[PDB]
């Protein structure tokens, strides 16, 4: 008497290892990957035409997003820019215009 055995596995069988990180031709792909790691959800679940929900619209997720951008694109100290995010496409256009600069 006294048992309720359940050994249910979620399953996360994944195996595909590449060294593909030289010459990020698609900035959009690399920025989408920044979002894919920050949000934790795959590339298909994030698009340019989308609103800032559980992607980059939360103080923790914005600090995580910034943390990525400092390394991935060198885009640092852009708190106001990340505060002005409404659409995901706007983030693509923002880092684009920020990389181009006024210099």
Describe the protein.
With 103 residues, this protein is mainly alpha-helical. The protein has one domain (1-103): Non-ribosomal Peptide Synthetase Peptidyl Carrier Protein, Chain A (Orthogonal Bundle). The protein has four helices and no strands. Helix 1 (27-38) packs antiparallel against helix 2. It is elongated and about 75 Å long.
How far apart, in Å, are the first and last alpha carbons? 76 Å
Number of strands: 0
CATH superfamily: ACP-like
| Oligomerization | monomer
Question: What is the correct CATH architecture?
Answer: Orthogonal Bundle
What is CATH's topology name?
A: Non-ribosomal Peptide Synthetase Peptidyl Carrier Protein, Chain A
Q: What's the domain count?
A: 1
- CATH C-level class: Mainly Alpha
What is the helical fraction, as a range of percent? Answer: 40-55%
| CA gyration radius, whole angstroms | 18 Å
Q: Largest beta sheet, briefly?
A: none
Structural class call reads mainly alpha
PDB class: transferase
Keywords: acyl carrier protein, apo protein, transferase, Structural Genomics, PSI-Biology, Northeast Structural Genomics Consortium, nesg
Assembly: monomeric
Entry title: Solution NMR structure of the specialized acyl carrier protein PA3334 (apo) from Pseudomonas aeruginosa, Northeast Structural Genomics Consortium Target PaT415
